[PDB]
């Protein structure tokens, strides 16, 4: 632990995102983080090249999705407008 690198990318949905995410919990955590598991080819994030597998999500489309289920998290993420603001963190063990 030494303060990760969180950043939000502003991209437009051409025809979907095409990626994978997994919910993980721990101690002293009353919420759930939408981590990244993989990225589908030809996706808005894959083609542009911003996020990668093994990352952590915080905010999507300017929405504080801190403490939601994967279903509500992923669903809301894909359920965004033309503009998308995904805030991913830089880390790894």
């Amino acid at each position: 632990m030494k303060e990760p690198e969180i950043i939000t990318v502003t991209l437009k949905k051409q025809n979907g995102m095409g990626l994978s995410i997994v919910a993980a919990k721990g101690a002293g955590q009353d919420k759930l983080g939408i981590y990244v598991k993989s990225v589908v080819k030809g996706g808005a994030a894959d083609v542009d090249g911003r996020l990668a597998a093994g990352d952590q999500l915080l905010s999507v489309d300017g929405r504080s999705l801190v403490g939601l289920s994967q279903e509500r998290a992923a669903e809301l993420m894909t359920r965004t407008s033309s503009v998308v603001t995904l805030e991913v963190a830089k880390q790894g063990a």
């Binding site: 095409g18 990626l19 994978s20 997994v22 919910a23 994967q70």
Partner: peptide, 6 residues
């Protein structure tokens, strides 16, 4: 702890 696709 599942893996969905958005």
């Amino acid at each position: 702890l599942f893996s969905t696709e958005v």
